[PDB]
Amino acid sequence: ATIHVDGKEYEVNGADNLLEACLSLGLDIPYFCWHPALGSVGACRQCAVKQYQNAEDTRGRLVMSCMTPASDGTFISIDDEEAKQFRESVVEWLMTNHPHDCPVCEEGGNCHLQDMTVMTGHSFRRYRFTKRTHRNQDLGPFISHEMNRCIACYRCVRYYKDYADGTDLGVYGAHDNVYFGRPEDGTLESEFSGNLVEICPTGVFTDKTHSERYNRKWDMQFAPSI
Amino acid sequence: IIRTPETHPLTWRLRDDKQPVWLDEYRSKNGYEGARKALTGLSPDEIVNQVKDAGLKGRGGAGFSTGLKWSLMPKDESMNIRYLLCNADEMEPGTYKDRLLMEQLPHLLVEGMLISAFALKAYRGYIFLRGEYIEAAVNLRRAIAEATEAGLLGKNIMGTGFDFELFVHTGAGRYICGEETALINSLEGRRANPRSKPPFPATSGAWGKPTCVNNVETLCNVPAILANGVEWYQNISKSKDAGTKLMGFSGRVKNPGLWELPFGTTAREILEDYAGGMRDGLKFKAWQPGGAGTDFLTEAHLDLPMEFESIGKAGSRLGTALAMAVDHEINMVSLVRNLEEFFARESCGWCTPCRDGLPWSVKILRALERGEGQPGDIETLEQLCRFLGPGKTFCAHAPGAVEPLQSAIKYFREEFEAGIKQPFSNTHLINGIQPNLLK
Amino acid sequence: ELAGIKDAAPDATFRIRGQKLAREPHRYSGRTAMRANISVHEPRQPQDIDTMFTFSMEGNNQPTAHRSQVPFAWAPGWNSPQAWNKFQDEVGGKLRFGDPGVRLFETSENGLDYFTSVPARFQPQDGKWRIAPYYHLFGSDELSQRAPVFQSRMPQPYIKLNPADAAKLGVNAGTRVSFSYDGNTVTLPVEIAEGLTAGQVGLPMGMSGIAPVLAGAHLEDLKEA
Amino acid sequence: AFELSAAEREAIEHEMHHYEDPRAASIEALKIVQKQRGWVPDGAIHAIADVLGIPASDVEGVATFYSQIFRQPVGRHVIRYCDSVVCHINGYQGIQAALEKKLNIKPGQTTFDGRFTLLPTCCLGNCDKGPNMMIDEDTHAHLTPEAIPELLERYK
Amino acid sequence: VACNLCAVACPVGCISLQKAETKDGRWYPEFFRINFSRCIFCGLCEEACPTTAIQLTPDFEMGEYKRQDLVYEKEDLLISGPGKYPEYNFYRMAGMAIDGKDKGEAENEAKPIDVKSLLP
Ligand SMILES: NC(=O)C1=CN([C@@H]2O[C@H](COP(=O)(O)OP(=O)(O)OC[C@H]3O[C@@H](n4cnc5c(N)ncnc54)[C@H](O)[C@@H]3O)[C@@H](O)[C@H]2O)C=CC1
């Protein structure tokens, strides 16, 4: 398949969506709800690009790159001004209720939400009203729970139920009061519950064992091991 | 008002004492004749083409062609499990037509579902009815029992070998459940989040099977089409939208109510000749044509025919065609605050712009209501209207949410500007740190 | 037969444009203070003669570097685990220059013969209890069961019994019964296993006091303590 | 603890007969438990999940999604006043204030004797006869603040 | 709060600390050491501090006989008051609950609404 991103030609797989095709090409599109192993659901609305009908089209429309096939002869723009404004607005809407928590948050320096907030260029707060707040749950000895930091991207429930076939994690409530966790306090029963700390793009689900002796990612000495 | 079967196909069987019409009285008034004709003398594809060239459109509010929607079911013979769903949710503020249809004429809906399920080859049918319509549920269950005892429902209907079972699924109170894919999710026993399209429910809907979702009023328009023919339905009115529509006016008018009118009836004709105009001492200020999710229109738009195309080019939507009148004593900021509070709390929470941008508009409108607005609030509301439009959110709940806000800002900007009193302050002073004073 | 372990990773002389592979990020902090309480003189960088990695930030961790051993994923603007997108050939696929690790053997051209040693069916002998292995993700592995965070996640020690066998022995759920293996009379509480076949005792393999070699063994004088 | 009664369980299986997937009876199972006991208690989630063969997290997600499935204890009678746009034009605020004065409780609360619980609700589909309220199963239209105390006496 | 922003912002790398937590969840440094034989007094750590904990003060008289004594631990750094910023409290802003400050008690925070609440 042939796509044209910002006037540049690219050869991609037509069976892929535009988000994974553009990320495979090295282009940067902000995203939350999509994961490579979980598929596309189009929830967070972060991955907006401007799609044009043809080469001689200047109006276009905003589409979700994760929900749009990377079909042959597809004309899109990432750096379009309206697309950039909408992506910044999505980050801003996520920022309205987000707690002032980065210094005391185990995700800091390793946080996809921090990276996408910086990537969209959103650094000025004009929202002045109250932030919604949630109580936390005890999830056992491995996973720490902090629902204030949730951006309702649904990655956790999609991984835990649709991928890992777990039964004791879910989404509750409605509108801006959606809650992600167990129906009651208790240990997460899945043998693969620990992947939530990397699946969750925020600091809702964090490594409790690491949190005991916490340090930031830049301070780590890493090695590839088995 | 005189009601004839030829001019009022949906409401001519309505009794004067507002009592429901049961099977004997319905069948005495040409009931199930269209069902008999469709099930005996017509192929399912013939009925689908009959509805398609009759020009029947979706009465849920979008006006999509019903025959075209029926044609999109797969031609695969191995897909023998099919569902017809009747969207009896009707949760739009300002909409009360389906309650009238199912409370007093339940057999009309039952017959329309029978004809549609024969045309769609749907082995099962479900009436997705809201939980607050208690009398509609009682009357629909009684009508289903009466039709089952007389052979209109069940196995071997009319001796034709067609098996059709009709259920009534009572809802648990969310406005998003009326969205058709969210309706399917709710019918499956899940949280009523909508689904992305394509695939449309015609190919993979309820439990992955071919599914067709239709409004109560569309299925009620079906039997008169099948009984009187296509030619009668085309010559009801000389408008691009064929047939009759339940239209009304509500809200501080002399006669708030609901009347069956041809398409192309002007909104002024409904307001004065049917609703009696505004009440004494009240002056007309604005109106919404088709429910809470439509743009406001002014007095200059009252001389416009109630069609999809005419209201669409006026900057609004025809919607449910149940208009609401707003008098001069109603503050527009408080009205849009009420509307946005409804829309924000009825968010399903799936997607960011609606779930986290409708409450921001609610808070801004609440601040504007008590004169606590700050500069940049109206620009924020306009940006929210632009960025919650079609294609930006996952479903059409939020574009409908921001239609009245943008129309009220367009037409009544002086009321929104009057709430801006305080200067903008997002920060407090921190002792020891000199602030960066932006110009 | 182990000749393929040479190509599992390149030797210690491997370089990316002359430089080693960094073990720590470029913003690694506290270099002149993390050991300052022991001595204010900063020690020599630990030398790695064994591998191509260096015990410092002075190395390469570019996503476009021609290697297969990636110590951690980081790209500018991508500090989260999403930087693995930058380290892959396509997103969700393989690492850009191949996944590490090689297979020791290929599929052989010819197969084996059919195994004709079909066992006889299980028969419950009186007074002998066949040990059925029960494994636990938290507890059966030796080193991981030594981890302190696993003790809360570890199940309590137990013995699984069929309802018919427990009724024959006159024990209920929770009653402590004792058995002798290799001259070690140990006592465990009984829990009832519906799906276990009669004539078997379910034991948690790999736990403290229950070796994994007990799987398939037999038990004598298993009675209530 | 919680135990499903024989009538509740039988009604739940009868509703399970109506669909090709027993998960589709979750809303009506919660409504059956709520109709019998006024609300859905915490053990009812696990009981309905066990009967339906679906996880308890799914049942709780359904129960907390839908506003008319009550996961907190309510009074003997649930007043649901419409706070939508047409009833706002027709003056639901006077009706709400009359309910405040008569019941001495805020919306979302329950009276001290457990007789009434006051709740706002979306449009009841009765906008031409507004303002509207819904006490337990009866809808009352053409409301006036004077008729509210007379309306509240016939619900003991 | 032992967020380690000052240590990474230090161009000399002369700050070393470790996070610890109280029973109520308050983050604090288990230790905090600064190598003042390395420190260039550039003020980047104070600039990077999001709680105004670390502060460069008007005191230059810092000469020492042994270089090992220029390693200042937490007992040589923590003073009895707020220093240059008298009123700022990070934990009044943070959403994380600690002792004396529950969920919904920070600035610009609404009270938590349970998903089981009867209000729509
Ligand atoms: N109580 C009520 O009656 C309410 C009505 N509405 C109305 O709902 C409308 C928006 O609903 P939507 O479903 O989003 O409208 P839509 O325009 O997306 O589609 C309406 C119908 O046409 C079908 N359809 C449309 N394009 C199709 C295609 N290419 N292929 C196959 N099927 C296709 C859909 O499946 C659906 O059944 C608005 O006009 C609004 O006024 C909104 C809220 C409440």
Ligand SMILES: Cc1cc2nc3c(=O)[nH]c(=O)nc-3n(C[C@H](O)[C@H](O)[C@H](O)COP(=O)(O)O)c2cc1C
């Ligand atoms: C948020 C939302 C709510 C809706 N609620 C209803 C409803 O309550 N009843 C209804 O018939 N259609 C409703 N619709 C429209 C449906 O999606 C669908 O178009 C209609 O029910 C069936 O199409 P039809 O008009 O061709 O019969 C809603 C749409 C949206 C976006």
Ligand code: SF4
């Ligand atoms: S989740 Fe990310 S953005 Fe939110 S407080 Fe934690 S580090 Fe900051």
Ligand code: SF4
């Ligand atoms: S808890 Fe994390 S993964 Fe789950 S929806 Fe919230 S931000 Fe996404």
Ligand code: SF4
């Ligand atoms: S616009 Fe988004 S959050 Fe709102 S009701 Fe539709 S899918 Fe749900």
Ligand code: SF4
């Ligand atoms: S003032 Fe000293 S401790 Fe602080 S950043 Fe500069 S060199 Fe490091």
Ligand code: SF4
């Ligand atoms: S002194 Fe400030 S920057 Fe350094 S760890 Fe403590 S709170 Fe963070």
Ligand code: FES
């Ligand atoms: S990543 Fe595409 S909408 Fe979320």
Ligand code: FES
């Ligand atoms: S607006 Fe109240 S009943 Fe519709």
